[PDB]
From Swiss-Prot:
Macrophages and macrophage-like cells. Keywords: Acetylation, Actin capping, Actin-binding, Cell projection, Cytoplasm, Nucleus, Phosphoprotein, Repeat. Gelsolin-like repeats lie at residues 17-65, 137-177, 250-296. PANTHER family: MACROPHAGE-CAPPING PROTEIN (PTHR11977:SF127), VILLIN (PTHR11977). Interacts with NUP62. Interacts with NUTF2 and RAN; involved in CAPG nuclear import. This is Macrophage-capping protein. It comes from Homo sapiens. The keyword Acetylation applies. The N-terminus is blocked. The keyword Methyltransferase does not apply.
Length: 337
C-alpha cells in the first residue's frame, strides 16, 4: 500500500491521509500539518533503517492508530529490519530532528498546500447560423467561415455581445426580417443583459464581422449539390475550432466543419481543437505564440466535446505543438506536408 520504492535509498516521508499513506512532496518535507500523523522512514541502506511515526498534536488519537497500523504495514514489508519510534509533535527525537537540517515547521488549520481559488471564467462561443424556411423559420448552426455563406440567404452571427443578421444580396426582405427576428430572439429571449443586434447587408459587413471571418471573398449563388437536409454534410464529421483570449475574453469559434480543412485556418497566436471524437481522436494544436490559458482552455473544450456529444469517455486527446504535428492530424487540404 505504499509507493513501493521504499527500499530505495534515503529518507521517505508520508502523511497518513485517510488510511492512505501519501508521499510528502519532496520540496515540502520538514513542514508537518499538526492535524495529521506521518510516517518518516530513514534508511542509509548499507546502514540501519528507522521508521518514525510522527504524531500531529491535533491528530485524533485513533487517526494515529491508523498510522501505527500503517507503520507495521511498512515495517512488515521491510521485514522488521527498521527500528520504530513514536515521535510526538514538539517533543521529537534528536535523531528525528537530525533528519531535518533547515529545521521543523508545524502548521495548524489552513488549507492544504497548492490550494487554489478556482474561478469559472466565461467563454464566449461564437456561432454562425443559416436561416432557412419560407413558412416556418429554422436556423442551423454552421461554422464561422465564408464557405458557409451564400448570397441567396440570411445568416445570424452570434459573436457574443454583438449579433448580426447578415443578408445576402439575392435574399428577400422577408427572409431578412425572419433573420432580424431570430437575432432579436437571441439578444432578448436568450439571456438579456447587454447585446446589440445589427442587420447587415451582403457587402457592407462591419469590422467585427471581418475580424472573425477575414477579408471577404466572392460568395456562392444559391443551392447547388443534389442531396437534401438528409446528410450532416457529404463525407465524414470532423470539425475544427479556435480557442483565443485575444479579446480579453476567451472565445471558442467553430472555424470549419467540412472535409478537407484549409491550413490557412491555423493561426499561430491561438490553439485549435480538431474534433474527430466521433471515430477516435480529438487533437489540440498549440500555436507557437499562444498562451497557457488558451492551451488550458483548449483541453477543457475537448472534454466539453466528449461530454456534449457522448464519445467513448476513453477517446484520446492528443496535444500537438505547431510544426511538430502528427501525420494523421494533417486532415487538411493538400500541402499539409
Amino acid at each position: 500500500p505504499f509507493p513501493g520504492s521504499v527500499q530505495d535509498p534515503g529518507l521517505h516521508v508520508w502523511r497518513v491521509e485517510k488510511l492512505k499513506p501519501v508521499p510528502v512532496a519532496q520540496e515540502n518535507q520538514g513542514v508537518f500539518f499538526s492535524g495529521d500523523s506521518y510516517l518518516v522512514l530513514h534508511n542509509g541502506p548499507e546502514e540501519v533503517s528507522h521508521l518514525h511515526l510522527w504524531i500531529g498534536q491535533q491528530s485524533s488519537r485513533d487517526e494515529q492508530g491508523a498510522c501505527a497500523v500503517l507503520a507495521v504495514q511498512l515495517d512488515d514489508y521491510l521485514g522488521g529490519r527498521p527500528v520504530q519510534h513514536r515521535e510526538v509533535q514538539g517533543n521529537e527525537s534528536d535523531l528525528f530532528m537530525s533528519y531535518f537540517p533547515r529545521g521543523l515547521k508545524y502548521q495548524e488549520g489552513g488549507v492544504e498546500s497548492g490550494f487554489k481559488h478556482v474561478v469559472p471564467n466565461e467563454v464566449v462561443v461564437q456561432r454562425l447560423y443559416q436561416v432557412k424556411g419560407k413558412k416556418n423559420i429554422r436556423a442551423t448552426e454552421r461554422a464561422l467561415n465564408w464557405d458557409s455563406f451564400n448570397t441567396g440567404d440570411c445568416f445570424i452571427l452570434d459573436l457574443g455581445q454583438n449579433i448580426f443578421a447578415w443578408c445576402g444580396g439575392k435574399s428577400n426582405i422577408l427572409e431578412r426580417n425572419k433573420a432580424r427576428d431570430l437575432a432579436l430572439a437571441i439578444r432578448d429571449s436568450e439571456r438579456q443583459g447587454k447585446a446589440q443586434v445589427e442587420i447587415v447587408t451582403d457587402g457592407e459587413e462591419p469590422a467585427e464581422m471581418i475580424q472573425v471571418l477575414g477579408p471577404k471573398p466572392a460568395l456562392k449563388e444559391g443551392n447547388p449539390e443534389e442531396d437534401l437536409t438528409a446528410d450532416k454534410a457529404n463525407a465524414q464529421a470532423a470539425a475544427l475550432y479556435k480557442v483565443s483570449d485575444a479579446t480579453g475574453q476567451m472565445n471558442l469559434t467553430k472555424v470549419a466543419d467540412s472535409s478537407p480543412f484549409a491550413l490557412e485556418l491555423l493561426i499561430s497566436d491561438d490553439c485549435f481543437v480538431l474534433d474527430n471524437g466521433l471515430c477516435g481522436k480529438i487533437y489540440i494544436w498549440k500555436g507557437r505564440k499562444a498562451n497557457e490559458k488558451e492551451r488550458q482552455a483548449a483541453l477543457q473544450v475537448a472534454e466539453g466535446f466528449i461530454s456534449r456529444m457522448q464519445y467513448a469517455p476513453n477517446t484520446q486527446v492528443e496535444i500537438l505543438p505547431q510544426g511538430r504535428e502528427s501525420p494523421i492530424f494533417k486532415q487538411f487540404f493538400k500541402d499539409w506536408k
